[PDB]
Amino acid sequence: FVEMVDNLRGKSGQGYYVEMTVGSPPQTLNILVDTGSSNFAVGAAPHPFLHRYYQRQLSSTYRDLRKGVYVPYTQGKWEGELGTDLVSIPHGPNVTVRANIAAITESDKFFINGSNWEGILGLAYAEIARPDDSLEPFFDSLVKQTHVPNLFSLQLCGAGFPLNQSEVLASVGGSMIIGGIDHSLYTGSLWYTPIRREWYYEVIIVRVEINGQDLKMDCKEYNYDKSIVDSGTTNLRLPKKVFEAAVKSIKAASSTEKFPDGFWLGEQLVCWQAGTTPWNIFPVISLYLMGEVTNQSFRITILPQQYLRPVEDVATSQDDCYKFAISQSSTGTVMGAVIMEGFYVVFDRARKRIGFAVSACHVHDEFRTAAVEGPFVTLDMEDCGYN
Ligand SMILES: CC(C)CNC(=O)[C@@H](NC[C@H](Cc1ccccc1)NC(=O)c1cc(C(=O)N[C@H](C)c2ccccc2)cc(N(C)S(C)(=O)=O)c1)[C@@H](C)O
Ligand SMILES: NC(=O)[C@@H]1CCCN1
């Protein structure tokens, strides 16, 4: 799928987005790819952080549904008006689809200054779309209206170091292959875990390790409430109990250096002289997921290069600085960009499963690399899922 390879732009901490056009004549907009929601929405009125926005009055194909819509996210929220219009993806399959579109009229802490995206593409299921499950999500409309296979895959590429606005604009930020899988985006084998239920892209974690050492918690604690794959979330987010235990372990593994509590809470950056970041003192983190085969599991392992996110501390500073991107949640585990930047993730909706393979663009050093390995069968499974 050469045509779609490299169709994403973006950065760590900012958001990965794809170019789409809406209405007639086509209006071009950068749309954030978000597997943590199911609404297709675009800025539709002026906003400080928006360089452009959808102008319904200039689209001859716009259809006003005369209904309001409200969408609150873990971070940010917005309000808008529902309609439908023709939508296309310049660097995706060659099709045009009539889709539901939330025209954003008011928002709070949703749009990000300097992000370059103006809308969001909720790729999860109807069950969680607002106002309710009757508002057909975009991917669903795409599959019903075309011959595109009911599957998409994502490769989000972090850089390992900061990028200014010009570099971010002139750089490839990943690929979103619509309807298929591109072997050039990963190495090794693709391991699949079941989509537990079709609402969020829900999965079940069966074990967690920090540098091979078992966190040793009841696996229900790992999925307490739920565990999901969310490309629209920056961090690897963990339930309070798991988070406290994981952080105590990461601290113990990296104790040759002491960091303020603010670092561990993600409130302050840590910096080292240019090129001297001590990646090796930080542990790798492994999450074991249920396999498709009964009593079988596999694990995905990330490196500190995935969980210590680069941040530019000023313009002529000779320091490499980062923020700890693992934080706590009171709404289950959220495998955000920190996990996704390490793997090629296949959302196989047709077979209700998610595949993971080491990403061809994941960041690493000469000594360690991200990994996807299995199978494991000593595993004490299911009672791991929450109810
Ligand atoms: C179904 C829907 C009504 C609710 N579902 C969501 O809220 C889900 N998350 C999807 C939203 C989508 C979104 C929200 C705001 C701006 C852009 C997209 N994402 C978040 O809620 C979310 C986004 C962000 C975030 O900054 N996302 C940006 C755009 C981003 C940067 C880098 C990579 C990917 C995304 C952060 C966090 N934090 C919780 S954190 C500090 O732990 O990572 C959460 C999930 C938490 O259930
Ligand atoms: N995310 C990006 O901007 C990529 C990563 C390396 C340079 N381009």
Swiss-Prot record:
The entry's protein name is: Beta-secretase 1
As for subcellular location, the record says: Cell membrane; Golgi apparatus, trans-Golgi network; Endoplasmic reticulum; Endosome
GO BP field: amyloid fibril formation; amyloid precursor protein catabolic process; amyloid-beta formation; amyloid-beta metabolic process; cellular response to amyloid-beta; cellular response to copper ion; cellular response to manganese ion; detection of mechanical stimulus involved in sensory perception of pain
Q: Relate the assembly described in the record.
A: Monomer. Interacts with RTN1; RTN2; RTN3 and RTN4; the interaction leads to inhibition of amyloid precursor protein processing. Interacts with SNX6. Interacts with PCSK9. Interacts with NAT8 and NAT8B. Interacts with BIN1. Interacts (via extracellular domain) with ADAM10 (via extracellular domain). Interacts with SORL1; this interaction may affect binding with APP and hence reduce APP cleavage. Interacts with NRDC AND NRG1.
Q: Which cysteines are joined by disulfide bonds?
A: C157-C361, C219-C384, C271-C321
Q: Which family does it belong to?
A: Belongs to the peptidase A1 family.
Q: How is it modified after translation?
A: N-Glycosylated. Addition of a bisecting N-acetylglucosamine by MGAT3 blocks lysosomal targeting, further degradation and is required for maintaining stability under stress conditions.
Keyword NADP belongs to the record: no
Statement: the UniProt record of this protein carries the keyword Signal: yes
Q: Which UniProt keywords apply?
A: Acetylation, Aspartyl protease, Cell membrane, Cell projection, Cytoplasmic vesicle, Disulfide bond, Endoplasmic reticulum, Endosome, Glycoprotein, Golgi apparatus, Hydrolase, Isopeptide bond, Lipoprotein, Lysosome, Membrane, Palmitate, Phosphoprotein, Protease, Signal, Transmembrane, Transmembrane helix, Ubl conjugation, Zymogen
Shown residues in whole-protein numbering: 60 to 446 of 501
Q: Catalytic center at which residues?
A: D34, D230
Task: Write out the GO MF terms.
Answer: amyloid-beta binding; aspartic-type endopeptidase activity; beta-aspartyl-peptidase activity; endopeptidase activity; enzyme binding; peptidase activity; protein serine/threonine kinase binding
Induction note: Up-regulated by the Ca(2+)-regulated transcription factor NFATC4.
